[PDB]
């Protein structure tokens, strides 16, 4: 009796009763009447693209007997992973929300371990991924490796007020003789905002994880965080409490000849990871929204197909939108040298030079208004029996026509 309609679906709704004979129906739609003609007995109401309008209480009364049927027609997300430390032991848990419910897989780079609960948190590149019908959204665990070379860019960590902050500080040392410490914006760190794990490596080496976390962030928690080890250099990262998209949308113009190898570019610092689309003359193609690691992500587009015009880049996240307009751009041809004047078309502006001597001497003169250019010269000549020639010049090439006198 309960109907579940998924989007603008095209399905048929039929019901059969074990008694085929000369029996008549009458459809009773959502507060409106409807006529029917069925088969012998099975009756039906089919629908192509069921709109939110075409849903609800739909009854069907029959008479041989005097029966009545009723149907309730009803209608049918991917939020990025969050982290929570298991209160039981020294292990992290991936809390990803989505409709349909997704596959939660921990990837330590590469090695994939689909568990939703990670206990082997030591080193490498740790990132949790959620995968459902919609797709795959991933949240990477922010790491500071004091053991590794510095990215010396004072890394910037962005997150919306209320979101959970997670910063793992990893340090590798020869002996176990070393400590790790966290420090906020000058201030140290809350007792319920720190946790320390430790294990051994190769030739009796020791790896230490001193991670810091915030349950729900606020403006209070925004600031410059630094991790220092008692055998390692203090590396830092600033936390910016905020969705946004920062990029120059000046709408840039370009021009090239079908012989040049070129890719359109867009540098942007945006959080959360934006959904981008490169559209042109209605035909839209998605983008490889890769990271430049400098402190921004640079999206590129290469399949120009030497096609001229407007290439628009629209990028948007959950709480922000953006668009940037990219403009893109022959031998002169004498369209017509009818009479007396001469017209030529070309790109760029064709230059019209005149010559008139019948040894070819030239005289100069004329008015020009324009790309197609129309330049003329009055033909009032004292002398006769000559030929004049109109010349249209362009950096690419030249063409000309001659007239008789």
């Amino acid at each position: 009796a309960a109907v579940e309609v998924d989007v603008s679906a095209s399905i048929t709704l039929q019901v059969l009763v074990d008694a085929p004979g000369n029996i008549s129906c009458l459809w009773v739609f959502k507060h409106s009447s409807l006529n029917c003609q069925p088969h012998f007995g099975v009756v039906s109401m089919v629908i192509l693209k069921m709109t939110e309008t075409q849903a609800g209480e739909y009854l069907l009364f029959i008479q041989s007997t005097n029966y009545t049927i009723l149907f309730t027609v009803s209608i049918r997300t991917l939020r990025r992973p969050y982290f929570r430390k298991m209160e039981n032991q020294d292990a992290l848990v991936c809390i990803s929300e989505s409709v349909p419910e997704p596959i939660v897989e921990w990837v330590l780079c590469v090695v994939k371990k689909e568990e939703k609960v990670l206990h082997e948190l030591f080193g490498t590149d740790i990132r949790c991924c959620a995968r459902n019908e919609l797709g795959r959204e991933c949240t990477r665990l922010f790491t500071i490796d004091l053991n590794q070379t510095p990215q010396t860019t004072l890394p910037q960590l962005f997150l919306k007020v209320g979101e959970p902050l997670w910063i793992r500080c990893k340090a590798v040392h020869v002996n176990h003789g070393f400590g790790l410490t966290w420090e906020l914006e000058n201030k140290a760190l809350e007792e319920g905002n720190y946790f320390e794990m430790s294990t051994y490596s190769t030739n009796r080496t020791m790896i230490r994880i001193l991670f810091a976390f915030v349950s729900s962030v606020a403006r209070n928690d925004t600031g410059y965080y630094t991790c220092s080890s008692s055998k390692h250099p203090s590396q830092s990262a600033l936390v910016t409490i905020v969705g946004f998209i920062n990029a120059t949308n000046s709408s840039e113009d370009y021009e090239i000849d079908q012989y040049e190898e070129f890719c359109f570019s867009v540098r942007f610092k945006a959080y959360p990871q934006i959904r981008c689309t490169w559209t042109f003359s209605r035909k839209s193609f998605p983008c490889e929204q890769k990271g430049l690691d400098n402190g921004y992500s640079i999206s590129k587009f290469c399949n120009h197909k030497h096609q001229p015009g407007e290439y628009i880049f629209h990028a948007e996240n959950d709480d922000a939108q953006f668009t940037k307009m990219f403009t893109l751009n022959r031998k002169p041809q004498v369209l017509a040298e009818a009479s007396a004047s001469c017209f030529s078309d070309g790109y760029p502006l064709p230059s019209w030079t005149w010559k008139k001597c019948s040894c070819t001497e030239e005289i100069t003169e004329g008015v020009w208004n324009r790309w197609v250019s129309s330049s003329t010269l009055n033909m009032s000549e004292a002398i006769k029996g000559f030929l004049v020639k109109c010349c249209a010049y362009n950096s690419l090439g030249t063409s000309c026509e001659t007239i008789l006198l």
């Binding site: 020294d90 176990h176 003789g177 400590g179 794990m197 430790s198 294990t199 051994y200 009796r204």
Partner: protein
């Protein structure tokens, strides 16, 4: 003296012991001190030193691959050698037990010792008592 500034007890030591146990013949004869004085500060430490002495003896009669599993459990408890523990006293009696028993106890001792390893001065543990 004997003390540890930063913690020499690993979080994943119970893993290395379960991994060793997975390739062990559990009733292999090892020994444990039978008459160690009741000392809730030095107790586990004395047995870890002894268990440690066993990991070394075992490595010598272990196959190429068993040597790695022993050594990896040895690393979890090798810190005890950072301290000048005196040789066992003449009063100390040893009793034959299964290596599974020794491994189980070692795990237990590491657990109990974990919260205190860096807070205590273990200078008086250097002399094993009966």
């Amino acid at each position: 003296d004997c003390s540890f500034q930063h913690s020499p007890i690993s979080s994943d030591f119970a893993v290395k012991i379960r991994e060793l146990s997975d390739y062990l013949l559990q009733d292999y004869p090892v020994t444990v001190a039978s008459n160690l004085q009741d000392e809730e500060l030095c107790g586990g430490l004395w047995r870890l030193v002894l268990a440690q002495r066993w990991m070394e003896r075992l490595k010598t009669v272990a196959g190429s691959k068993m040597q790695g599993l022993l050594e990896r459990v040895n690393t979890e408890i090798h810190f005890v050698t950072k301290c000048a523990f005196q040789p066992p006293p003449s009063c100390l009696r040893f009793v034959q037990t299964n290596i599974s028993r020794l491994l189980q106890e070692t795990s237990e001792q590491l657990v109990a010792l974990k919260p205190w390893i860096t807070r205590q001065n273990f200078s008086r543990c250097l002399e094993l008592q009966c």
